[PDB]
């Protein structure tokens, strides 16, 4: 707020660190406002969104991570293959089949087709 009050737009690294800190603490609702502030400053919110979802997953916050991922995927933002694999693996290890299947559908719609690993995770939850 101090930096913004003087009419100076912050840098990308500052916003990235803020998003990482909000994701590590589990405060998912306080990261979407930072993403919107980056969007209104004509930035790109792809890498920041990926860092947010990764830090939410690594901080034992799965439901909010899946919510943020589904909210960002509907806006036309694709993700890396490693996040696609990590989300599915974690949601199948916990026992969540709905979010895993939704992420798999979004992955196949973005262009990357499912491999044996994915199907195998889904079968684990199904069996």
């Amino acid at each position: 707020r101090r930096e913004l009050s003087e009419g100076l737009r912050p840098l990308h690294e500052t916003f990235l660190a803020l998003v990482r800190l909000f994701g590590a603490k589990g405060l998912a609702t306080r990261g979407l406002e930072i993403l919107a502030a980056m969007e209104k400053l004509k930035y790109d919110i792809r890498q920041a969104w990926l860092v947010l979802v990764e830090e939410l997953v690594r901080s034992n916050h799965l439901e909010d991570a899946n919510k943020v991922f589904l909210k960002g995927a509907e806006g036309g933002l694709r993700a890396t293959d490693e996040i696609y694999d990590l989300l599915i693996e974690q949601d199948c290890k916990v026992g969540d089949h709905s979010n895993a299947l939704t992420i798999a559908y979004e992955m196949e719609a973005a262009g990357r087709m499912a491999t044996t690993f994915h199907f195998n995770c889904l079968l684990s939850v199904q069996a």
Binding site: L101, A104, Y105, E108, M113, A114, F119
Partner: protein
């Protein structure tokens, strides 16, 4: 390509003398049990 995975299972079976009551027995304001036909003439 993952399919849509639609699942519909139509099951058939022989009814039980207890489940048959779940169709015709209905509630009433006074509370008397109704659902039985006891008169031969209908009109």
């Amino acid at each position: 390509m993952i399919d849509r995975y639609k699942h519909q299972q139509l099951r058939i079976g022989s009814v039980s003398p207890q489940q048959i009551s779940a169709w015709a027995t209905k509630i009433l304001p006074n509370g008397e049990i109704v659902g039985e036909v006891t008169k031969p003439y209908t009109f």
